[PDB]
Structures are given as structure tokens and as C-alpha cells.
Design a protein around this ligand. Sequence first.
Ligand SMILES: Nc1ncnc2c1ncn2[C@@H]1O[C@H](COP(=O)(O)OP(=O)(O)OP(=O)(O)O)[C@@H](O)[C@H]1O
Ligand SMILES: [Mg+2]
Length: 656
Amino acid sequence: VHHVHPLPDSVPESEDLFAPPPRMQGKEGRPKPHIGPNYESYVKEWAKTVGPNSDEWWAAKARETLDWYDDFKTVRAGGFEHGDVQWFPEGTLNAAYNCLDRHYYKNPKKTAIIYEADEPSESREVSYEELMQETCRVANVLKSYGVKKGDAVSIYLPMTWQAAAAFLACARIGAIHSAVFAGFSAESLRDRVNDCECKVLITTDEGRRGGKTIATKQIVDAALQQCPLVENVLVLRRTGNKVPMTEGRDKWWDEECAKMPAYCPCERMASEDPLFILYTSGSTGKPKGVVHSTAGYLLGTALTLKYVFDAHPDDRFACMADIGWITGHSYIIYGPLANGITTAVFESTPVYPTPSRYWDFVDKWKATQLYTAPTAIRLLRRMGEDHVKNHDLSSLRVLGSVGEPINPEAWHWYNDFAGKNQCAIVDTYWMTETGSISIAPLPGAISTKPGSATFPFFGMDVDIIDPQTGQVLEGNDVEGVLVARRPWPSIARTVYRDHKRYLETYMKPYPGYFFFGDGAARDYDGYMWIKGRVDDVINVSGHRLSTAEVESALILHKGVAETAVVGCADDLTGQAVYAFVTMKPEFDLKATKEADLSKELAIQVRKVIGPFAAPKKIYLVSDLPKTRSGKIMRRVLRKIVAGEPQIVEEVKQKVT
Ligand SMILES: Nc1ncnc2c1ncn2[C@@H]1O[C@H](COP(=O)(O)OP(=O)(O)OP(=O)(O)O)[C@@H](O)[C@H]1O
Ligand SMILES: [Mg+2]
């Protein structure tokens, strides 16, 4: 008799609640959790971070977490309506000083970065001394190019450890870095280079990902022909293969840095000075250049890492994402290094050289936390349990998931093999615009449900609004759109040179609130469930269906690897459901007739969700359209099913 149901799972609801395991109880010599041991301990602290008397907690956390050059006087000001959000405005600091120097001064030999190379034998540890010295050399090179405080600098680097040095070198001198996924086309790179109006670009000669070569310098050359403002290009010699170099414009990273000293002073940045620009992926439309300031963002990534992953000084955090993504910004570089711990820069893929790469990595360095996306979790689950069953992995305590709703079926595989039912699973929900994790379980306090992000993080006061009325739905067992009531420190301050798009997208749909764009429900116990994008909702005869419902129901069928449902106009039901299903490679499509597989899928969905939710048509594909981030581009499939990289050719053909 609950209007809000959990995501479909093979495990019954009465046996599907997972309390913090002994590794997250301070047992076996593991570190004691910062928040624990139950839900009330989370609320007792969270209540200090929201409301009209939360300034005391935030002012204390800001001064305790970051090193300041000048103290602040005001804690917060501004709001959503005009986009004038301010946090600690009178304070001065530097991100590079907090992520490097202050930890170098205490323990220079401590490992800052575990550089897991594409080839495993080429991996090595990078100390804080080496990362700070290389950062200061690059900062000295940029200053010799005439880069000033507030100038934009484009970054087009793959997942090599020097990418963090390029990030922090810009932050050290007050330049706004704008990282772009290594592998984006010359057209995509050009649009982001021209939009930020940078005069300097940093890239490599070539990149190496999963035994493949990214011709980064060749792509830069093609883009820069239509980028008339770039005057200086710094090229890192990653592979050593012959690439074109333009005289005067292009210089070698190693030859420039060798001329510069190994220390560079820190520019004293105001709290609201812009730290970086990051362009979104654009799963729903044209990407926007999200701008984050300094103090609020840095404090948010520092606190979230410490509490969402229960990080302790000697931990080795392993976020396997790419720094072209906000996950890499906040939980590879800024978050982990601000806390002064060891972070991982993973250059390869989850299946190179073999699908055991994640776990050969975990046992080699004894990683204490793992952070990845559901697309990689569903990829390793598809390759069999024989790449995971015979590893140790006991060094881990917390496993993370970010980017999309994680199906309970994929949640359990993560829980059973990567954690061996001894790790806590943090389903972390947030956006590029939020800066830091918005809704996630605190691993030493929250009992988890497969597919639920649980409860909002410190400083986040979220509510559910009925989109039909624009009113907040009070209580539990409610469903609607997710919004936030007040600003938080790490919130995006603007969209670069397009503040109107920033207010129209996030601040004007529901005035007084921040609009995430996601559908959400709060069950009877108060747990939040992110149902999917509001744009991706399908309305069949007045039944509003989310993507996470049907896809989680479809994956409950044997052999199903990954699915994606989109809507299309129907004359009887208003909209009809179309399913794109990917089976495991070992599945026999000849012994099992396809028409009977579709019928079994339609009954599997009807038995878990309802009669209305059965897909009207089901297409079998080899893969789905996905961004470099890993998100499924359901907007593309919807247009194909309506008539309007290489996987798009297989989808358009099979749709006719
Ligand atoms: N843990 C999660 N659970 C559910 N959805 C998630 C989770 N983490 C991320 N998401 C989804 O990802 C979105 C944020 O993704 P990101 O900021 O990388 O860009 P995007 O939404 O793909 O971009 P665009 O708005 O330009 O289309 C969220 O709004 C949500 O839809
Ligand atoms: Mg979005």
C-alpha cells in the first residue's frame, strides 16, 4: 500500500536493507567512521548544516578545512533569483596552496597520486613534492606566456598524472582552466576553446587509453585553424611519437619547464574568484560552460570526500573516472588532494588488458575506496565473475557509483563481488552544476537500499515538487521533481558569459528553488530515489513512467546486459514505450527466438511495474549511444524512434 515503490529487484524488500558492514564499524582495526553508527547520527549533524542557524557550522568547517590568506567576515549572501550567490566573500585563499603546498610542508614524500598507467608495468607513485614541483614549473611557464589572474586556459589532456599539475598550475596563478575530454572531436574542442576565449592551450602529443592511441596533437591542430585567439600551445611528450609542431606557437612541456624554477608563488584569490569552466556532456541538449568559484567549491569537495567516502589520512582513494568530467575535477584532484590523501589517476579502461584490471589495481596499491560509474559496473558484470572471484580486495571499505541510477541487479553485483558483502555502497547523486555530491549515504551511518541515494548531504535541503501544481509535496511516499531550497557552498555561480541561460535553466522553472531536472521520489522511510531525467519521462495513458523503473525491470531477465527505454507518440496511450536491449555476448539468439524474448521482457515488466508499462516495441542492439561521460543518450534514441559514434548507424538501420 505504498505509492512509492523501490526500483525492481530480485531480492525481496524485507531482505534488501544493508546496514554498515563491520569494515565501516571501526572493527578489524579499520578507521572509525566520522559519522555513525546509525541514521540519527547523520541527522544530528546534518541539522547543523541547514536552516537559519547553520552559519556557525559552516564558518567553523571553512576555517578548519582550508588554509586562508585572509579570514572572511560574511558566511553567505545572495540567492537563486538573480544568481548572486556568495560564500565567505571577504576571504582569500589559493586552491593549489590547499591541494599541494600545505601537505608538502608536512610530509613531502607522501604519495599524492597513484599513477596507474595504461600499461600496468609503467605505473608509479607520485609524491606531493614531485606534483608540487611540476605544478610550479607549469605555472612559471604560463606566467612567461603572459597569463594573468582571470584569464582562461584550455586543457586537452588525457588521464596522465601531469593533468593534475596543469589543473593546479592554473589555479596557482588564478587562471581559469577549462578542461576538455581527451578524445572530443576537433569541432567539439574548437567550440569550447572559442567560447572561453583562452589564449593558451595545454595538451599532449598523443594519448593512450586501453591500448589505443588518441591523436591529441593532431586534433588540436585541426581545431586551432578556427581558433584565432590561441597564441601558445604547451605539448606534453606522453608517447614520444612524431607529431606536427608549429614554430613559435607550439613548445614542448619538458623543454619549457626545464627553463623554469621549481617553485612559484601563489596568487591570493578572493573566495568568489572563478576557479574553472567545465562544459557539460549535453545528453539533453547543447552543453553549457559551468563556472565554479574557489572557496565554496573547494570546501564542498573536501567535505564530501571526507564524509561520503569516510576518508582518513592514510587512505588511497581510487576514483577511476576521467578529469574531463566533473567527477574527475572534484573526486580525483580537488577533493582528495585538499584532504591531503592519496588519489588515483587511472589511464586505462575497465577491461584493458583484461576485465580484471580494476581488481588487479585494487590489490596492487591496496586501495581503500573505489569510485566509478554504473556503465562500467554493468560492463564488468557482463564479462563474468571469474575476473573478480579470486581477488583479495579486502583493503576496500567503500564502493561508489555516480553518473546514472544504478539498477539493483547491477547494485548487487557490485556488492557481492567487488565488496564481497563487506563494503558499503555509496550511490552518489549530483550534477556538474552542484559541484559536489548532493545526495548520498554516509557509509558509517546509513543502511542502504539498492538504487537509492538515501539522504541529502550537509548543506543540502531538498524537496519534492508536484510539477502539475508547482507546490512542494510534504511528507513521505511522495513523487515528483527534485529541487533545493537554499544555496550551498559549491553551487555553480553562472554559465560562462551566459547568465540568462543559468537563471532560465535552474532558477526560473520553480522560483525560489534550484531545479535539478531529475525526477525523484521519497519513499515511506524518507529515502530519496532518483528516477531519471524529467525529459526522459514517458506518459502512457496518464501513467508517468521513469527510465530507471523499466530498465531495472528489463535487466532482471537472464542474459540482459544493458537497456534504455524512450517514449514516442501513440494514438491510444498518448505515448508508447520503446526498449533498446543489449544481451550478454554469450547469449544464444538463435536457440531463443526473439519474439519470445520480447514477450518474456514484456511480462517481466508487467509483473514488476504494471500492465501499462510493457514496451510496445523492443529493439535488440549491440550497444547504446553513450557520451564520453558514460551516460546513455536517450535523447538520440527518442529522435530515431521519431524519424529525425558508430553505434548511431546500427540504431537507425534497426529502427527501419
Ligand atoms: N547517482 C545518480 N543517480 C541518478 N542519476 C544520476 C546520478 N549521478 C548523476 N546522475 C544523472 O546525471 C546528471 C548529471 O550529469 P552531468 O552533470 O555529467 O551532465 P548531464 O546531465 O549529462 O548534462 P546536460 O544537462 O548538459 O544534458 C544528473 O542530473 C542525473 O540525471
Ligand atoms: Mg543535466
